[PDB]
Amino acid sequence: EHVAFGSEDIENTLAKMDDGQLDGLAFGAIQLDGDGNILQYNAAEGDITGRDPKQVIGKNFFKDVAPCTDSPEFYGKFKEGVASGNLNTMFEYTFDYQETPTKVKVHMKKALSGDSYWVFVKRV
Numbered sequence: 324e325h326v327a328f329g330s331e332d333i334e335n336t337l338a339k340m341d342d343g344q345l346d347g348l349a350f351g352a353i354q355l356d357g358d359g360n361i362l363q364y365n366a367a368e369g370d371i372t373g374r375d376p377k378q379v380i381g382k383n384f385f386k387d388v389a390p391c392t393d394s395p396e397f398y399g400k401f402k403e404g405v406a407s408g409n410l411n412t413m414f415e416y417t418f419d420y421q422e423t424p425t426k427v428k429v430h431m432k433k434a435l436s437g438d439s440y441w442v443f444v445k446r447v
């Protein structure tokens with residue numbers, strides 16, 4: 324899939340993408356509900372993090388999969404952007420739960436329709 328990380332219209336291009344098309348992206352992509360439960364999780368993300376994309380869908384990202392993100396700097400921004408019903412934040416972060424510490428760039432952005440949220444990830 325020909326989509327760049329950070330692109331201005333990313334929520335339109337990825338809108339309603341199926342799991343197979345999401346696996347074609349150059350960067351990691353996760354879709355969460357407003358509680359943080361994982362709806363979609365692509366192959367590029369699994370290659371970065373080690374998680375198995377099939378097994379994590381349905382788990383809670385903040386409570387279960389990614390406790391290192393349960394902090395004001397990641398989860399706090401997520402829950403505030405959900406609450407305003409609007410979210411568009413980009414920041415670097417380190418993933419270090421049961422893995423070699425890996426620094427990434429994270430982009431969280433509200434998905435176009437409904438009440439869903441994207442978490443995009445690439446290495447830095």
Ligand SMILES: *C(=O)/C=C/c1ccc(O)cc1
Binds near residue numbers: 353388392
């Ligand atoms: C910290 O616990 C980070 C964990 C993590 C980040 C991103 C993922 O896709 C999976 C786990």
